Swiss-Prot record, chains A, B:
Function comment: Thick filament-associated protein located in the crossbridge region of vertebrate striated muscle a bands. In vitro it binds MHC, F-actin and native thin filaments, and modifies the activity of actin-activated myosin ATPase. It may modulate muscle contraction or may play a more structural role.
Disease: Cardiomyopathy, familial hypertrophic, 4: A hereditary heart disorder characterized by ventricular hypertrophy, which is usually asymmetric and often involves the interventricular septum. The symptoms include dyspnea, syncope, collapse, palpitations, and chest pain. They can be readily provoked by exercise. The disorder has inter- and intrafamilial variability ranging from benign to malignant forms with high risk of cardiac failure and sudden cardiac death. Cardiomyopathy, dilated, 1MM: A disorder characterized by ventricular dilation and impaired systolic function, resulting in congestive heart failure and arrhythmia. Patients are at risk of premature death.
Family affiliation: Belongs to the immunoglobulin superfamily. MyBP family.
Domain of life assignment: Eukaryota
Gene designation: MYBPC3
Residues involved in Zn(2+) binding: Q54, H56, E69, H71
Stated name of the protein: Myosin-binding protein C, cardiac-type
Full-length numbering of the shown residues: 151 to 258 of 1274
Residue ranges occupied by any Ig-like C2-type domain in the UniProt entry: 3-102
The organism's taxonomic lineage, starting at the top: Eukaryota, Metazoa, Chordata, Craniata, Vertebrata
UniProt PTM: Substrate for phosphorylation by PKA and PKC. Reversible phosphorylation appears to modulate contraction.
Length: 104, 104
């Protein structure tokens, strides 16, 4: 099958009900790789952190895996749409598309 | 499995003998999507077109698929390495990592 990129685990499509919370994540094998999350081509979600959105990055020493999380909270209908996770290392770039659907 | 991105067909890992030729390609469902090919993070292969490297983009009307090709010719040992295909549409971005190994 397909070449192995940077994503040990890609972000997945998700569904949430209005007012609900949902987490998206990515894992990258092990400087730390650096993540960016986007809605659409150009909206950098780091600029949107607040009551509805939070980011958290961590590292598991045993497995040598880096975890990147995107937390959506109190979901609103406008959050529905197309998202992208981008990761960079000293030597590579990769990215991964996924979708969020907000119901109700 | 994983969310559907822009790649109907991702570029694959390839192997070639020195002096050999090899083609890498990507397919994207249907302005045309626009491709960039890289070696490493930053070398834009459009700037390297010549006796060893050529690019060709086309469209199949029946299937509505766009094809992006990277042709490597008279392969040299230094061409071995990590490559990336990036594609953009009006609404999305995606990319795909792959490797070339030159033997002998």
């Amino acid at each position: 099958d397909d070449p192995i990129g940077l994503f040990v685990m890609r972000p997945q499509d998700g569904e949430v009900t209005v007012g609900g919370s949902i987490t998206f994540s990515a894992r990258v094998a092990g400087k730390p790789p650096v993540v960016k999350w986007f809605k659409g081509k150009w909206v950098d979600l780091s600029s949107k952190v607040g009551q509805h959105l939070q980011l958290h990055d961590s590292y598991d020493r045993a497995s040598k895996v880096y975890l990147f999380e995107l937390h959506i909270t109190d979901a609103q209908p406008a959050f529905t749409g197309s998202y992208r996770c981008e990761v960079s290392t000293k030597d590579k770039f990769d990215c991964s598309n996924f979708n969020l659907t907000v119901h109700e």
